[PDB]
Amino acid sequence: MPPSEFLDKLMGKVSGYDARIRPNFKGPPVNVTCNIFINSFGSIAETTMDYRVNIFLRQQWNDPRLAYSEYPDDSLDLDPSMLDSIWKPDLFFANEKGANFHEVTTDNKLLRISKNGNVLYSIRITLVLACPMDLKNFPMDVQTCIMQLESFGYTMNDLIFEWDEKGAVQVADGLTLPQFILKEEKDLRYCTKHYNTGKFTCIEARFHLERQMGYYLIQMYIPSLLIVILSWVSFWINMDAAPARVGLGITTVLTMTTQSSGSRASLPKVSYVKAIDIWMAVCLLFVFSALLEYAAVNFIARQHKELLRFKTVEEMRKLFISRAKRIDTVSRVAFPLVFLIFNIFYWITYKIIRSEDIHKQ
Amino acid sequence: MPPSEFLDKLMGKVSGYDARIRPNFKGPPVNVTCNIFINSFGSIAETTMDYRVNIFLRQQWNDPRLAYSEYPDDSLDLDPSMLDSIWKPDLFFANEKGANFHEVTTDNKLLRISKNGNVLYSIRITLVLACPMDLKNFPMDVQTCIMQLESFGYTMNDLIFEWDEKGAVQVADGLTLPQFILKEEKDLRYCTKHYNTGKFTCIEARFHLERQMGYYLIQMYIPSLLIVILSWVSFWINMDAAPARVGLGITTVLTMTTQSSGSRASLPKVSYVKAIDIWMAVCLLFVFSALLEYAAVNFIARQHKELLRFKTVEEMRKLFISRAKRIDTVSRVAFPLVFLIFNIFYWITYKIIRSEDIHKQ
Amino acid sequence: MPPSEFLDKLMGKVSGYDARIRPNFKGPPVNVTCNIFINSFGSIAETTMDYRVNIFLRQQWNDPRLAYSEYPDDSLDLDPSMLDSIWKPDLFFANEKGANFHEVTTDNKLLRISKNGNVLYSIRITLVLACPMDLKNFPMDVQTCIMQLESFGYTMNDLIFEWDEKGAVQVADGLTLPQFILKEEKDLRYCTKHYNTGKFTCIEARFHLERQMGYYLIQMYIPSLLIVILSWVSFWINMDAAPARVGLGITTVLTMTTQSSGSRASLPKVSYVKAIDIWMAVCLLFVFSALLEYAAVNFIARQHKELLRFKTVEEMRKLFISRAKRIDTVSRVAFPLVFLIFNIFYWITYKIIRSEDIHKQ
Amino acid sequence: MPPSEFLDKLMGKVSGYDARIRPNFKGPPVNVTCNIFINSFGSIAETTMDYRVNIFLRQQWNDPRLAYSEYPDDSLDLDPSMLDSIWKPDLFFANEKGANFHEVTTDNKLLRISKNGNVLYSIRITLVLACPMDLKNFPMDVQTCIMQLESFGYTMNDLIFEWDEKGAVQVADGLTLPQFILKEEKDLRYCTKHYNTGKFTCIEARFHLERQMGYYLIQMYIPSLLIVILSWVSFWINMDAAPARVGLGITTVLTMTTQSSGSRASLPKVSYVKAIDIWMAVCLLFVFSALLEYAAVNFIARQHKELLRFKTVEEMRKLFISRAKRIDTVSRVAFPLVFLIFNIFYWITYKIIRSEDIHKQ
Amino acid sequence: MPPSEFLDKLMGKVSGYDARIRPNFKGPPVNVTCNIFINSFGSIAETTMDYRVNIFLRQQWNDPRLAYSEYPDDSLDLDPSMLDSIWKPDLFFANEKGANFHEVTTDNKLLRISKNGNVLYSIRITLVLACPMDLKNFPMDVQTCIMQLESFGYTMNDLIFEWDEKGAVQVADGLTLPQFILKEEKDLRYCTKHYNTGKFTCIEARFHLERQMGYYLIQMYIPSLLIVILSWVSFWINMDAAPARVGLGITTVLTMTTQSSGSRASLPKVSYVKAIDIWMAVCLLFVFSALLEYAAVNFIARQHKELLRFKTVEEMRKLFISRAKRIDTVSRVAFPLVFLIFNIFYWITYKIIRSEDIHKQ
Ligand SMILES: *[C@@H]1O[C@H](CO)[C@@H](O)[C@H](O)[C@H]1NC(C)=O
Ligand SMILES: *[C@@H]1O[C@H](CO)[C@@H](O)[C@H](O)[C@H]1NC(C)=O
C-alpha cells in the first residue's frame, strides 16, 4: 500500500478539501493553542527600542477534515513542502520591526497530523520585536518586553487563539544574556484588539529582564568616584597660594562634564532625568563646590594681604589666617562626610525602589 | 451549498470578470476612499531627512461587478491569497525611500466584499518616508512630515482618491516617541500632480511633531552655562598676577569650541545658522571676553611695573592699581548681568516664535 | 465590444507578435527617445564617491506591429502587469552601484499605445550612481555628476538611443539639497561605447552641483581663526617671563593639529592637497611662529640675565631689554597684518578659480 | 543510447520515485555521514558574539531506490538543477544567525550517484554562527566555537546523522586569521536534542581559537607602562615645591582613566572583571599612589614651614627635611620594585592558567 | 521566413537539445575561454580584508549542437530571456564574500551564436572579493589581490577553463582609485584545485596595487614630526628652572601616544609590527628622551643647590653649572642630528625594500 496515493488522497483534487475555507465553516470558532520555544534571545538596543529573538512557534488546531483513520499509526510526520495545501491560520506579531523565515538547506518547518484531525505546525522565525523600555532608573531597573500574537484577517467569531496550559513558553538550556538576566516568571495574558474593521484576537507573553550592575560600576561609578577623591586631595594638602589648585579644579570639572556626556552615549535622547544623571550631577556639584571653596579661601587671603599692606595691624593678620585655616580644615572633614551621606541615601532609595517594582509587575 | 463553487463562480474563467479592466470602464472615475491606521511611528533621523512608519492602509471602492446577491450574509471575509484575481488600484507613495511588505507566516492582508459590490482592502506596510525638515530653530521647533498617496498609472478621468470623512487617520493607543510629541491635529488636504504624461490624483496627510526639550537642556544648555560660570570665577577670586587665570581661560575657550563642534554632530550640514549655534556663539564670546579682560588688566599692571622701575612716582602707582581694581570689579558685576539680559531676550524671542509658528501651520 | 478580446487579440498566441524579436527586424535601427524626471536627488557621499537619485524613466519607441486602428480613441492606458508580453528595450546604467525597482502595492509602471504604434513606457527607479568627484578645492568647488544610459545587448545597427528635443530632463518642483545647489543647465551629450564584443549606444546627462559655504564657515573657518586670535593675545599682553605663554602656545598648536585632523574626517583619503589643507597649514604655521617668537624673546632675556650676573655693565641691559621689547611690538603689529594679506590672496584666488571653472564646464 | 531517457527514467512520473518519502520507509533510520570543508573562516566579533564561516557541506546517504545498474560507469555527475526531484534530508544549523545560499552564475551545488544508490550532495553555504565566548581573561584566552548540524523535522527513529571516520573536517590550505590561531584538534562529538515534540539528532564540531598577543601589547600594555614610567619621573627629579608635579600627576591619572575606558571599547558590556581590567586598575592605582606620595611630602614640607615661622627651632627643620627626603628616596626605589613584583606574579599566573585551560578543553 | 520558428526550432521540444547534458558528452572536455572587463574597481577595506569590483564576464565555448547553418548571417544576437534553455557552464568565484546579479530594467546579459556553434556569453556582476593583504610595511607596500574562477560541479575530465590569448583582462578607460594605483601587468596563471570529491579546474588573475603616499604624509608623518620639533624647542630656549618644560614634555608625550593610537584606527588588529609603528615608536622615544634630558639637568641643578646651602664652596658651583649647560647644549645639537640619521636610514631602507618586492611579484 503506497504512501503517495494516501498523501494526494487526503488533500487533493479528488478530495473535497479546499485550503481557502476554514475548518468548521459557518460554525464555532477555530480554537488554536500556541506554544513558544525560545532558541536564542538577545541583542537588546536602547537606541532603537527593540530586541531580536529567534524562536520556534508551535500552533495546534483541530480540523474536522483530514482525519485519515486508515494507517495503523496514530501520528505521521509529513513533508514540509506540502504545507501550502492546507489551512494554516494567519498569525502575525503586532510589535514587529520585520522578520525573516529560515531557508538553510530545506525549509525549517514541521507538519504532524493525528487520527482525529489534530494538526501540529512548527516554524522557526527570527523576530525583531519592539520593546518600549522606560529608563527612569537607568543602571538599576527591570524591563518588561512584549510579544503579541494576533490574527490579521479573522475576527473573534472565528480563529480564537489560546495559550498552552502546560509549558506555553520554554527557553533553551544554558541560554544567557551578557547584559540582562531573564526572569523565570513569564506571565501570560490575552488582550483583545478593537478596530473599526472589527474585533481581533490576540495573546501576549511578557518577559522580565534585570540589568547586570557589574559593567556599570567599573565603567561609570568607580571613575566618577575617583575624580571626586582627586578633588578632595586639594583641601588637605596644597598650600593656600598655589598655581596648581586651580589646575586640579578645572581638570576635575572638565573631566566630570566629559564623563557626564559619556554616560549618555548609547542612551536614546529622552526628556526625563535618569538615575545616572542624578549621580553625575551630584558628583559634578561636589567638584564645582571644591573649586569654589578654594576660591573663597584665596579671596580671604587676598583681604589678609590687602590689609597687610596698610602692632594694631598684627591683630587682624591672625584672624584672617585663622579664618582661612578653619574653613580649609572644615571643608576637609565635611566634603567626604556629606558625600557619604549622599551615597547611603541614593543607594538605599534605589534598593527599595528596586524591591518596589515587582509589585506593579 | 459549497462555498468553493461560489468563490470561483464570481471571479473565474466562466465569469466575465477581467482583472485587467477597471470597474465602470468607459465611465465615471472610480472613487476610492482611503483610511490610515498608524501602528508604530518613529525613527526620525535629521541626517537622512526621513522617518519610518508601520501603518495599516485601508482603501474602499465600489465595483459594479462582484455583487453576489446570493448568500444571506451582507459581508464575507475572503482568503488573502485570492487578492491577485481582482482589480486592486495602483497606489504608491510619492516621498518614498523604499518599503517592504509583511510576510510573517501568511500574508498580512484582508479582503471583504458586500452585497452591493463594495470592496474593503487592508494592507500592513512599513514605509520609510522622506521628511524635508527645516532646522532654523533647532532645539525648539515644530516639524511637519508629509505622507502622500498617489496613482502612478491612472489619470484624473479614472481612479479619483478621496479621504474618509470620519476617522481618516488613527493612531494606536499608547503610542509615544522618545524625542517628539505627535500632535492630534492631522490636517488633510489633496494636491493634484501635473506631469507631461498627464494629470494624476494625490492626497496628503500632514503630521505635526514638537521636540522634547528635556534632553537638550541636560546635554547642551546646562554644561555650556557651567563653563561660563567657570570663566566667571577668575574675576572675583584670582589675584592680578597669576599663572592660573591664563590656564582657566584657555581651558574654558577650548572646551567651548569642542562643545560647539559637539552640538553639530547628529545634525546634517546646512548653510543657515541654527538657534543652538547662536547660543554657543554667544557663550564662546563671553568666555573669550573674560580672557581678554584678564589680558587688559595684566597689561595695565605691566604699565604700573614699567613706570615703577623709573614721592612724585608714588602718585601714579595708586592710579594704575585703582584702574586695575576698578576694571576687575566692574567686569565682575557686569558679565553675569549682561549674560542674564542675553538669556531673557533669547528665551522670550524663541518662546514668541514658538507661538508664532502655529499660525502658518 | 469587450476590451478583453482586443487585449489578447493584439499581443496573443493567435497574433504573430513575438516579444523576442525587435521591431523592424532585418531593418533600420529602433530609434528610442528617453525622458528623465527627477523625483528626489540627494544623499551625496564623498567617502563612497556616489549619490542616490529616485527618478522616473520614460522611453518612447515606435513598433510597426501593435498598431490597433480599431477603437475610436487615439491612446489607451494599459495594465502594468502585461508589460512582459512586449518588446521592451534593454537599457542599463553604466555607472551603477546597484538599483531597486519599486513594488509598493502594485508595480510602479505605465504603458500607453497609440494608433500608429507608438509605445510610452514609464518606470520609477532608485539609482545609486557613482560620481568620481575631484576635490582639488574642497569647500568651494563645482562637481559634475554623470548619468549614462546604455544598451547592454544590442549594437549600433539596432536600438539607437536619443534624447528628447524638449524637456529631456525635468526636476520636481521645490526639490532642494542641504549641502548642494543643483544648476539648471543639464548639458546633454552622447558618447558611444566601444568594446571587443561590439559598438554600443549610450547617452549621457550631466548635473552641476555647487557647495553651500554656510556650514564650512561655522564649522572650520571661524574656529581656526579664533585660535589664531588666541595665539595673538600672548604678544600684546603677557610679560616676557611667564609660565602661561608656553601654555597658551602649546594649547593653541595642539588644538590646531586636532582641528586639522578633524577637517579630514568625512573626506576620502586622497594624495593631492585640498584648499582646506592649505588654510589649516597656514594657520598652524602662524600659531607655531607665535610660539617660536616667544621662544626667541625668552632667549634674548636669557642673554640679558646671563650678562647681568657678570656702570659699563648697565649699558648692555638697556640694549637687550630694548631688543626684546622691539621684537615683541613688531611681532604684535606684524602677525595680524600678514594674516590679513594671506586672507586677501587666498580668498581672491579661490574666487577667480571659481569663476574660471565654468569655462571648462 | 541517449542520456536524457535514462535521466527521466530513474526519477520520473513513470518511475515510482516519490521525493516526499524517505528511503527505507517504515524501516531502519536513514544513516547520513556529514563532511565539512572550511573555505574561509573569519570575522569574529565579540560585540555580537558570533563569527562568519563560508563552508562546503557534504552529506552522503544511501537510497535503496535510484540504483541504476545500467551504465558501464560506477558514478555519474548530474545536473545541479535536478536536485529538487530527490529526497534531500532536512539539515539546519542550531546556532544560526542567518545564512545565504550562493547563486553566482549557476547554483553552487553537486550531485553524484553510484551503482548501489549512494548519493553525494555538496553545497556551498556562508554561515553566520553564534559563539558565546567567555572573556574572563580577555587578552590571553582560548575560545571554543560551536557548529551544530541538526534535523528539524525528523525524530531519531529516522535520519540519524553521523560524522565521517576519516577527514570529517578539513580546512583550505594557507587559511589564516589576523587575530586568532585556529588549532588543528577539532574534537567531534554528538549531542542529541530533546523537545516536547520529540527527540532529534544533532552532531557538533568544536574549533579552538587562541588570541594573538602582538596587537594587544602595542595597543594597551606598552602605553600604560609608559604612563607609569612618566609618573615615576616626578620622584627622582622634581624639587619638593613645584607647580609641575601636580600637573604631571593629574595628566597621568586622567590619561590612565581615558585609556581604561579605551580598552573596553570593542568589548561587549559584561558583569565580570577581565584580565585587562586588573592590569589597568593596578596601573591606575600606581599613578594615583604617586600623586598621593607627592601630596604627603608637600604636607610634611608645610609642617616644616609652619614650624619655621614660629637655635632650638633649628633642630626640628632638619628632622622635617630629612623626613621629606627619606620618604622621597624610599618612594623612588620602592615603586618600580613593587611594580616589578606585580608584573612577575600577573604574568606567571596568566601563563599557568593558559596551560591549565587545555585540560578542560 | 519567420525568426520565431527558427528560434524554437534549434532549442525546442522537437529538437533533441537537452540543456542538462554537456556538449561533447562522453567525449573530450569542454574548452572554455574566459575574458574579463573591469567596469569599476574600488572600495578596498583593510578591516574586512576585501574589495568590491563590478565586472563584465565573457566566456566562450563551442557546442557541436546549435550549429544552425541556415541564415545568411554568421552571427546573431539573441534574447537574454532565453538563456535558461541552453548549457551554461557552472563558474563560481572561490574567494567570494557574496555577489549580486544586475536587474536594472531587463537582465544585463548577452547571447551570441555563430554558424559553427560558438557561443558568446556576457554577464555583468558586482563581486565582493576577499584579498588577504599583508601589512608588514603599511604606508608603502604593494598588495596583490586575487580573482579565481572555478568549476563547482565538474571535474577536469570535462569543462576545462582557459584564459584568452589576447586581451584576457581589460580595464575601463579613465578608471582611477583614490588610495591605490592599479598596475598594468595583470599576470595570469592557473592553479588546479584538489578535493576529496575530485580535481576541479581553476584559473586566476592577479592585480597589483600600490599605495598613494600623499595622504599618509599629511595625516601622520608631518604632525608627528612637528611634535618632535616642539619637544626640541625646550632645549635651546627655556631656562633650567621652569614650570613649563615639564608641561611641554608631558603634552608632547601624551599627544604622541594619542597619535600612535590614532594611526592604528582603520587598521585591523594584527600581531606583527608595521612600518608606521616603527616610526611612531622612534618619535615617542625621542620625545620621552627629551623629557628625561630635562629631568637629568634639573637633578644636576638640585645637587648644585644642595651643595650651595652647605671660597672653597664657590669652586663646585661653577662645575655643576658648566655641567648643566654642557649637557643642555650637547642635547640641543645632538637630538635633531640623530633624528636626521634615523630618517635617512628609515627612508632608504623602505625605498630599497620597495624596489625589492617586484622580484617576488
Ligand atoms: C473553543 O472553546 C470554546 C470554549 O470552551 C468553545 O465554546 C468553542 O466551541 C470551541 N471551539 C470549537 C470546539 O471549535
Ligand atoms: C465620484 O464622485 C464624484 C463627485 O460626487 C461623481 O461625480 C462621480 O460620478 C463619482 N464616481 C463614480 C460614482 O463612479
Ligand SMILES: *[C@@H]1O[C@H](CO)[C@@H](O)[C@H](O)[C@H]1NC(C)=O
Ligand atoms: C532613426 O533615425 C535615423 C536618422 O534620421 C534614420 O536614418 C533611421 O532610419 C531611423 N530609424 C528608424 C526609422 O527605424
Ligand SMILES: *[C@@H]1O[C@H](CO)[C@@H](O)[C@H](O)[C@H]1NC(C)=O
Ligand atoms: C545505521 O547504523 C545503525 C548502527 O550500525 C544500524 O543499526 C542501522 O540499521 C543503520 N541504518 C540503515 C542501515 O538504514
Ligand SMILES: *[C@@H]1O[C@H](CO)[C@@H](O)[C@H](O)[C@H]1NC(C)=O
Ligand atoms: C581542449 O584543448 C585540449 C588541448 O589542445 C584538447 O586536447 C582537447 O581535445 C580540447 N577539447 C575539445 C576539443 O573539446
